[PDB]
Design a protein that fits this description.
The structure is cut from a larger assembly and holds 10 protein chains of 10 kinds.
Chain B (H helix, E strand, L loop, with lengths): L1 H21 L8
Chain C lengths: L11 H23 L1
Chain H lengths: L2 H4 L3 H24 L1 H5 L25 H8 L3
The chains are: A mainly alpha (32), B mainly alpha (30), C mainly alpha (35), D mainly alpha (36), E mainly alpha (449), F mainly alpha (31), G mainly alpha (37), H mainly alpha (75), I mainly alpha (348), J mainly alpha (318).
The complex binds digalactosyl diacyl glycerol (dgdg) (DGD) (2 copies), chlorophyll A (4 copies), the ligand CC(C)=CCC/C(C)=C/CC/C(C)=C/CC/C(C)=C/CC/C(C)=C/CC/C(C)=C/CC/C(C)=C/CC/C(C)=C/CC/C(C)=C/CC1=CC(=O)C(C)=C(C)C1=O, 1,2-distearoyl-monogalactosyl-diglyceride, beta-carotene (3 copies), CA-MN4-O5 cluster (OEX) and 1 more.
């Protein structure tokens, strides 16, 4: 299940990347 | 002659539709 | 002399609707009526 | 209100809802009702 | 970004605010290309990882790998998959390429200028500027011509495409004599779309396919040069709407038709879509079943030739309305089917019972038996089976997936054509927003009835 | 704190949250 | 399957194909932060 | 308070930061404990067919159902 | 008060409180609509979540059993119960919740509470309309849905053996109920169903055509692409051109509405009329009085073997549906049909 | 003035009682052709061997049959998807026996309905109206195309096409479910929601407007002017805009019919609906039947009966 576990880890990091960019940009008054 | 009766009914319905489109009351109202 | 006396009113569209309905209903039940 | 971006709240809650539906489809191919 | 107060378009129509923004529009298109290339690479690597050498690709629900296999990569005699690394290379290449396109799109959507005409005149373009529009079409027309010639090159050089009709067994073959006769190449175009003629879906020889790509490749490149050095003629300007939405509507309508054609190709064609990788076609599966029983019963001791069925129209064999001897049963509808496993047993007049009585090769049987079991029939939950079947087999013909998906895509894009085209025509007239409330044309028209 | 509006909100939400937990556990039961 | 060297990276390739569908979701998220100007 | 105002009140979130989790957990425990099978008499995956009856149960007595269904359920 | 001035009573107090501006209109009807509807829908959820028909229909119908949203369903009680209301205190469950659920009591609970809920909902329509001082056309229109429910979930089950032959609350359950009617009642051939289908298809056509016409004859009352922005909730002038619409349909279809009132009255009459027609047909099926087949063609087909029509072909299909589902669909009948007795066509 | 120009005007003339158009130029003749043959066929057409098993099914009021039973028999299975023009047939009698009229009617009908859609836009552009009325008419046209073309093609025969008759329509629907389980297809479910919902919305909108205009004033201006909005049960502001409401009144039904049409087209490629037969299994492996299994039992009955003599092999791959 190590493969499945690290698979979910990858899914979390990748899925969180898009919101991460928005949150950061919004926080620093970026052009969003 | 049941087929003749059926044909008459079908023809009659079509005839009503005809006058309902060409002999209809002029649509003076919008 | 009944003041309640009134008159029925049938317009062209109403007449067309009635005739269309009576014919369509016949076309629908005619088959079953002749079974 | 305040100190809370409602847009983020929606994005997070929405992500969780997608996850719950995913578990349902997972259960469709696993355990009971999996045809195996 | 942008707001409706300054564009008149709501968030649900935001991309419509990029119509006059050439620079931003470039980023949007470039980015979308990144997404397409990304999936091509990502899904390919996913398929490679989920691929197993103990099962055919069609049984493994793989759609991209069959394409590379048809190009003649990691395949061997009989369509057997020798290696998959070539497929891995394709996924890696597309995936990394998508990154480059993605960066360009993001840049031309953030840092890049909203317009280019002001700075880069060559890229700068204004809808209605027919000359510039035709020039842009020309550039892309040449690109597509080069792409078709790349395929033609792979066919006659750098190896060859897989030929399911290859002599002495199906395998990759380097096309050396591509059909260049216009009558044969353009014959398919004038062929009826009805049964038998099958329009362009009838193409069964790779020679015509490569030769046809030779024709389309040259014409597209020549057409591009023409549109690059010519401007629309008066008749065209008086019979076309010159606007971005109008141009999009034209593309939407065309791509919609192409989608429907692709659906039929995947469902009927077996040459461009090798049954070895894409699985058997609907007609192929039916004919395979008739062949499977015909062979089994004949071995048991049945004369398939004089075997009258319940209707009296022949249990195993019968005559096509045209006269050709065909398999009996409901498969009579697929009498025009042609497969590399059945052709050898056929002759000038339909099937040859002589070959059916003797000369039937074991592979001709094994292949038909496998196709019969892996018919295109399937369910949304991927429960393989004609219908009314228990949940035991997990398989849905890849042909079914492509045929259903591209058909739906074509339908929506056709509806998009109607929406954009009509709106474009109305916009030009000026009544896209609505009636003037003071110049209502109907009020000035005849009172009719 | 317990208005008709509040009562209605918890009249469905509270039961739903429990039901959702039960359905999730059902997705991990093995025959 | 992926080459032996790229085998330890199978989980990642299992998540890559679904990445494109997330982009359209990200668009609506951006509009949400934008408040759908 | 508009639902949006409440959906922004971090206090409301804190108030439901424990109750909502507990409500879900209870639901999971309910099924995991097996209480659901006993509460609704829903046959467990191992008690659908008894040694006596290897076929689906058919209740035939309306006024003698209580005892019949119990016997069919193998008590 | 009461065109005479009267002393206020507790009724007046309760009246004002129930009939009081509130997040949701409680009113007096709500006292029936809110409780019954909650128990009905709630029971359906509880049933589909953790309730089995293993002892009523011998079928797994619960998410706990492993069923999905489509398969899960609250099945009807066993045919042995007949038309028994099957109360929890009834002579069957005898106050046993577990057994009451095993006996299929929840189905009756959901149906009974849901039936009164619909009554309360229609009463709410009249109540709200009376407060708004508007003709309750919406309530009169809600009669068609209620008629369908009563005829399909009450009249039919009562006309047959028991609640067992009634629509079970489930997606797949409704599907098998539909297939059963075709195989046994030939519902499709029934003229009343035909009129009902016409109404539903006709109403859908009216809804789509009306929305398209209005949204396509809208006047330009704004300076932006988005036409939705160019509208005032308290505007007096019509947002669209009835004239332009009339001419378009007068030339495209040959006829067109000229009175907005008549148009909308027609939009509500078509659907209501159709539902009521189908309800009368279901009443006939309850008593097994169905238009199964035309004797004239049946006699001709028997005497003349070659004679054949799609009507005769459909008759054979119905024969298969009944023979290849009766064994399980009707377990009370305990019918064991040897495979040889079952009607099967060549091959297949 | 050039006569061709003069003609072009008359064609685009809005003074015509029924607007003729460039689309009508092809629509009128095609539909007139299909209507004539359909009327003659539904009345005097001789039996047709639809199953291509030499067993001709009787049709037309003359050859017995009735308004309900009567229908235009689909083309013979032998022809399949092959083009069968009257001139290709050796004798008009053969054309009737093989089932040619059906193919001719469908061909002259589909072209007409497509041109009818174009004619709608043509008049809208001539009147100065928005150009999306046809898009709504695209939903019904798409459904007709699937039952009379897409499905016939996917199956590989025009015989599969829905017969032009009441009883024939029912037969087509039954056999379809027996082979595709259309009821368990999510797209058909959307279509049923569209019609059921469309009827609900039509009844409500009609009732609201009627009660309001009960008296040119806006559809609800009256009730709005009073301000006694029924937010008691209509607690919302999404459809406060009449344009917003009417848009939904069109989107809900049209989008639903689009899905059901695509659903039928996908099932035409052998993509049947969800199959959960024997999905629930006990601990030891015994199959616990469900409502789905019961539906399967019926599907089997229709399957074993359809084409009693048109199957020489067990699998119905066709
Ligand atoms: C909410 C909607 C449902 C969401 C389900 C999410 C997971 C899923 O989807 O579930 C399916 C899979 C994940 O589950 C796997 O689905 C597989 C589906 O079969 C595939 O794999 C099989 C393996 O034996 C066979 O090879 C078979 O031929 C092949 O089709 C198998 O059943 C596996 O056992 C199972 O684990 O994800 C997928 O496919 C993802 C699919 C992405 C989009 C695919 C579009 C296909 C075309 C659409 C347009 C045309 C028609 C639409 C009609 C409607
Ligand atoms: C075009 C519309 C009419 C299609 C008529 C038809 O019989 O359709 C099928 C034909 C294909 O015909 C078949 O094409 C086949 C091609 O396979 C043949 O050639 C193959 C080569 O690999 C194999 O050898 C195979 O064994 C062999 O049989 C055969 O020729 C068959 O005899 C022949 O019937 O489609 C085609 O030609 C391609 C037509 C373009 C695509 C159209 C898709 C549908 C479009 C819109 C649907 C929705 C409309 C909504 C309203 C508007
Ligand atoms: C293929 C999908 C796609 C693409 C390529 C675009 C592209 C674009 N949109 Mg758009 N949009 C989309 C879908 C898409 N959209 C959808 C589905 C909606 C409906 C919700 C909208 C609604 C919308 C509106 C209302 C507007 C745009 C606008 C724009 C333009 C600039 C965006 C902006 O102003 O701020 C940029 C946004 C951000 C900076 C937030 C994050 C976006 C980044 C660039 C995505 C990068 C993700 C990726 C992981 C990065 C890779 C980095 C690399 C190193 C790997 C731009 C060219 C704006 C415009 O120009 O109007 C004139 C505008 O107002 N869009
Ligand atoms: C490459 C093809 C293409 C392109 C470039 C455009 C471009 C545009 N369209 Mg459009 N359209 C297309 C195809 C295309 N369309 C097709 C095929 C259809 C038929 C369904 C439509 C139907 C359509 C309508 C009805 C409308 C537009 C509108 C618009 C404009 C507004 C952009 C926008 O909405 O902002 C931002 C982007 C969005 C808001 C999109 C949101 C994301 C969508 C809704 C989610 C869908 C996901 C989907 C289910 C995934 C599966 C797709 C596929 C596999 C089936 C814009 C310039 C609007 C307009 O006013 O025209 C001027 C409008 O009203 N289009
Ligand atoms: C349809 C494909 C396409 C098109 C038409 C353009 C067009 C253009 N690009 Mg470009 N670009 C693309 C794809 C494309 N790009 C991709 C895929 C990438 C990723 C590598 C880039 C990365 C890129 C960069 C880094 C720059 C351009 C720049 C430019 C502009 C001037 C180019 C130059 O060299 O002068 C200068 C021009 C309008 C330049 C510019 O200023 O943008 C406007 C520039 O800086 N592009
Ligand atoms: C995507 C491919 C594509 C597209 C979009 C167009 C589009 C167009 N072409 Mg064209 N063309 C193409 C491929 C294409 N062509 C190819 C491959 C060739 C080589 C055979 C030509 C050769 C060609 C010529 C010789 C002419 C056009 C012309 C035209 C314009 C008149 C309208 C028309 O449809 O043509 C014709 C009208 C109908 C098809 C109806 C139009 C904008 C005409 C033009 O306006 O000059 C630029 C013109 O005379 N094209
Ligand atoms: C040889 C031959 C002839 C062979 C043919 C044999 C054959 C096929 C026989 C069958 C005959 C047949 C028709 C059988 C069906 C029988 C049957 C099922 C009958 C049902 C009767 C009935 C009373 C049913 C109950 C339900 C019911 C009342 C349904 C009504 C359905 C109905 C009429 C709905 C509307 C249909 C329709 C096309 C509407 C058009 C509306 C219209 C003119 C829009 C224009 C318009 C719209 C706007 O929005 C605006 C703004 C304006 C201004 C405007 O104008
Ligand atoms: C209020 C909501 C009323 C409908 C609830 C539907 C529901 O709970 O489904 C619950 C079902 C449960 O799904 C089933 O769970 C079982 C547990 O033992 C098994 O795992 C089955 O294999 C699985 O299909 O959800 C599904 O159908 C799976 C797809 C998700 C569908 C959600 C639909 C929600 C809306 C309807
Ligand atoms: C503009 C904008 C938008 C968006 C857009 C887009 C769509 C972008 C994208 C872009 C992109 C398109 C991105 C991508 C990226 C990717 C990448 C960067 C890749 C990488 C790769 C790597 C790193 C490697 C991998 C590997 C290999 C290949 C081998 C094996 C193993 C592995 C798998 C690991 C939106 C909508 C929001 C709206 C607003 C604006
Ligand atoms: C590769 C190959 C080949 C070849 C193919 C080809 C050759 C294709 C082409 C195709 C084509 C050839 C295409 C084109 C198209 C175009 C068209 C089809 C046209 C259209 C037109 C339009 C759209 C217009 C219209 C109109 C009119 C005229 C009137 C006014 C208005 C308008 C202008 C709009 C082959 C076969 C060997 C097979 C294999 C592969
Ligand atoms: C019977 C009875 C009763 C009552 C009971 C009740 C009332 C109950 C309730 C119950 C309930 C109240 C339940 C709930 C349910 C719900 C649920 C279970 C949920 C579901 C959902 C889902 C499953 C979802 C899915 C998805 C979508 C589609 C959306 C979003 C999210 C997701 C994505 C996930 C009484 C007491 C009178 C007594 C006598 C008996
Ligand atoms: O033709 Mn109408 O139908 Ca559809 O499946 Mn195969 O082919 Mn016959 O069988 Mn069952
Ligand atoms: Cl049949
Ligand atoms: Cl057969």
């Amino acid at each position: 299940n190590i493969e499945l576990a690290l698979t979910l880890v990858s899914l979390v990091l990748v899925v969180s990347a898009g919101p991460l960019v928005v949150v950061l940009l919004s926080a620093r008054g970026g052009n969003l | 002659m049941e087929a003749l009766v059926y044909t008459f009914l079908l023809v009659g319905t079509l005839g009503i539709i005809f006058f309902s489109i060409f002999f209809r009351d002029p649509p003076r109202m919008i | 002399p009944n003041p309640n006396k009134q008159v029925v009113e049938l317009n062209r569209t109403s007449l067309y609707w009635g005739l269309l309905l009576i014919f369509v209903l016949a076309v629908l039940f005619s088959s079953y009526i002749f079974n | 209100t305040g100190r809370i971006p409602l847009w983020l709240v929606g994005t997070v809650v929405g992500t969780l809802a997608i996850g719950l539906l995913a578990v349902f489809f997972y259960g469709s191919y696993v355990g009971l009702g999996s045809s195996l | 970004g942008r707001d409706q107060e300054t564009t008149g378009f709501a968030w649900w129509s935001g991309n419509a605010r990029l119509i006059n923004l050439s620079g931003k529009l470039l980023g949007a298109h470039v980015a979308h290309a990144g997404l397409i290339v990304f999936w091509a690479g990502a899904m390919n690597l996913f398929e490679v990882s989920h691929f197993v050498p103990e099962k055919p690709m069609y049984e493994q629900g793989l759609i991209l790998l069959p394409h590379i296999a048809t190009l003649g990569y990691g395949v061997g005699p009989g369509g057997e998959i020798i290696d998959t690394f070539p497929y891995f290379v394709s996924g890696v290449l597309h995936l990394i390429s998508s990154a480059v396109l993605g960066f360009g799109g993001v840049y031309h959507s953030l840092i890049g200028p909203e317009t280019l005409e002001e700075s880069y005149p060559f890229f700068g373009y204004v809808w209605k500027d027919k000359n510039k529009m035709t020039n842009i079409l020309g550039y892309h027309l040449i690109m597509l011509g080069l792409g078709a010639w790349l395929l033609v090159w792979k066919a006659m050089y750098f190896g060859g495409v897989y030929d399911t009709w290859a002599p002495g067994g199906g395998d990759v073959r380097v096309i050396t004599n591509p059909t260049t006769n216009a009558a044969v190449i353009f014959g398919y175009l004038v062929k009826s779309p009805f049964g038998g003629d099958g329009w362009i879906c009838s193409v069964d020889n790779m020679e015509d396919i490569i030769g046809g790509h030779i024709w389309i490749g040259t014409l597209e490149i020549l057409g591009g040069i023409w549109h690059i050095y010519t401007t629309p003629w008066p008749w065209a300007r008086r019979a076309f709407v010159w606007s971005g939405e109008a141009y999009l509507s034209y593309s939407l309508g065309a791509i919609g038709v192409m989608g429907f054609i692709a659906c039929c190709m995947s469902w009927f064609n077996n040459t461009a879509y090798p049954s070895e990788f894409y699985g058997p076609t609907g007609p192929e599966a039916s004919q395979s079943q008739a062949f499977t029983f015909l062979v089994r019963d004949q071995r048991l001791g049945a004369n398939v030739a004089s075997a009258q069925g319940p209707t009296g129209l022949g249990k195993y064999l019968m005559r096509s309305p045209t006269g050709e001897i065909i398999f009996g049963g409901e498969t009579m509808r697929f009498w025009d089917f042609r497969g590399p496993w059945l052709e050898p047993l056929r002759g000038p007049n339909g099937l040859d019972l002589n070959k059916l009585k003797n000369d039937i090769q074991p592979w001709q049987e094994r292949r038909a038996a496998e196709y019969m079991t892996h018919a295109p029939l399937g369910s949304l939950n991927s429960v393989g089976g004609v219908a009314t079947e228990i949940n035991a087999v997990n398989f849905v013909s890849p042909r079914s997936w492509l045929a259903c998906s591209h058909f739906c895509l074509g339908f929506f894009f056709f509806i998009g054509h109607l929406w954009h085209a009509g709106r474009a025509r109305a916009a030009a007239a000026g009544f896209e927003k609505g009636i003037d409330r003071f110049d209502e044309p109907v009020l000035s028209m005849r009172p009719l009835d | 704190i317990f208005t008709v509006r509040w009562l209605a909100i918890h009249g469905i939400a509270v039961p739903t949250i429990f039901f959702l937990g039960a359905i999730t556990a059902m997705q991990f039961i093995q025959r | 399957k992926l080459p032996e060297a790229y085998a330890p990276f199978a989980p990642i390739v299992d998540v890559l194909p679904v990445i494109p569908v997330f982009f359209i979701l990200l668009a609506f998220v951006w509009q949400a932060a934008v408040s759908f100007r | 308070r508009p639902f949006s105002d409440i959906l922004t009140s971090i206090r409301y979130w804190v108030i439901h930061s424990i109750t909502v989790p507990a409500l879900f957990i209870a639901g999971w425990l309910f099924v995991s404990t097996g209480l659901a099978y006993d509460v609704f008499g829903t046959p467990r995956p191992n008690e659908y067919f008894t040694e006596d009856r290897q076929e689906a149960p058919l209740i035939t007595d309306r006024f003698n159902a209580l005892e019949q269904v119990k016997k069919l359920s193998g008590n | 008060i009461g065109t005479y001035q009267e002393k206020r009573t507790w009724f007046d107090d309760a009246d004002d409180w129930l009939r009081q501006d509130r997040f949701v209109f409680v009113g007096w009807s709500g006292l029936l609509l809110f409780p019954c509807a909650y128990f009905a829908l709630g029971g359906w959820l509880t049933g589909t979540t953790f309730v089995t028909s293993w002892y009523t229909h011998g079928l797994a119908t619960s998410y706990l059993e492993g069923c999905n949203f489509l398969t899960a369903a609250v099945s009807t009680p066993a045919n042995s119960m007949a038309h028994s209301l099957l109360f929890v205190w009834g002579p069957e469950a005898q106050g046993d919740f577990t057994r009451w659920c095993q006996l299929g009591g929840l189905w009756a609970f959901v149906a009974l509470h849901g039936a009164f809920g619909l009554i309360g909902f229609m009463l709410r329509q009249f109540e709200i309309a009376r407060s708004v001082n508007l003709r309750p056309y919406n309530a009169i229109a809600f009669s068609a849905p209620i008629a369908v429910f009563v005829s399909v979930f009450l009249i039919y089950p009562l006309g047959q053996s028991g609640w067992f032959f009634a629509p079970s609350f489930g997606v797949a359950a409704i599907f098998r109920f539909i297939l059963f009617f075709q195989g046994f009642h030939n519902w499709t051939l029934n003229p009343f169903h035909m009129m009902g289908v016409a109404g539903v298809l006709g109403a859908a056509l009216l809804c789509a055509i009306h929305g398209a016409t209005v949204e396509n004859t809208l006047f330009e009352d704004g300076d932006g692409a988005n036409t939705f922005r160019a509208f005032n909730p308290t505007q007096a002038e019509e947002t669209y051109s009835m004239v332009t619409a009339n001419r378009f349909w007068s030339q495209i279809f040959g006829v067109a509405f000229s009175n907005k009132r008549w148009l909308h009255f027609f939009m509500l009459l078509v659907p209501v009329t159709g539902l009521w027609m189908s309800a009368i047909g279901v009443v006939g099926l309850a008593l097994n009085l169905r238009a199964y087949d035309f004797v004239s063609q049946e006699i001709r087909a028997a005497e003349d073997p070659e004679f054949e029509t799609f009507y005769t072909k459909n008759i054979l299909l119905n024969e298969g549906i009944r023979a290849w589902m009766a064994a399980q669909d009707q377990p009370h009948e305990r019918l064991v049909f040897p495979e040889e007795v079952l009607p099967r066509g060549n091959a297949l | 003035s050039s006569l061709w120009a003069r003609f072009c005007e008359w064609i685009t003339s809005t003074e015509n009682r029924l607007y003729i158009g460039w689309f009508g130029v092809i629509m009128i003749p095609c539909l007139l052709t299909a209507t004539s043959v359909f009327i003659i066929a539904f009345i005097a057409a001789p039996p047709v061997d639809i199953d291509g098993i030499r067993e001709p099914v009787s049709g037309s009021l003359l050859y017995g049959n009735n308004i309900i039973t009567g229908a235009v028999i689909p083309t013979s299975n032998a022809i399949g998807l092959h083009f069968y023009p009257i001139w290709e047939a050796a004798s008009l009698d053969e054309w009737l026996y093989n089932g040619g009229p059906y193919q001719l009617i469908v061909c002259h009908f589909l072209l007409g309905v497509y041109c009818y859609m174009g004619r709608e836009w043509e008049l809208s552009f001539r009147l100065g109206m928005r150009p999306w009325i046809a898009v709504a008419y695209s939903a019904p046209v798409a459904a007709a195309s699937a039952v009379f073309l897409v499905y016939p093609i996917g199956q590989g025969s025009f015989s599969d096409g829905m017969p032009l008759g009441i009883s024939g329509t029912f037969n087509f629907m039954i056999v379809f479910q027996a082979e595709h389980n259309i009821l368990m297809h999510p797209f058909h479910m959307l279509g049923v929601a569209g019609v059921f919902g469309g009827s609900l919305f039509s009844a409500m909108h009609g009732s609201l407007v009627t009660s309001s205009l009960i008296r040119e004033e806006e559809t609800y201006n009256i009730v709005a002017a009073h301000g006694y909005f029924g937010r008691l049960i209509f607690q919302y502001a999404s459809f406060n805009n009449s344009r917003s409401l009417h848009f939904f009144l069109a989107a809900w039904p049209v989008i639903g019919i689009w899905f059901t049409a695509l659903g039928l087209s996908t099932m035409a490629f052998n993509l049947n609906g969800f199959n959960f037969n024997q999905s629930v299994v006990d601990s030891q492996g015994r199959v616990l039947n469900t409502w789905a299994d019961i539906i399967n039992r019926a599907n089997l009955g229709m399957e074993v009966m359809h084409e009693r003599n048109a199957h020489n092999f067990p699998l119905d791959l066709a």
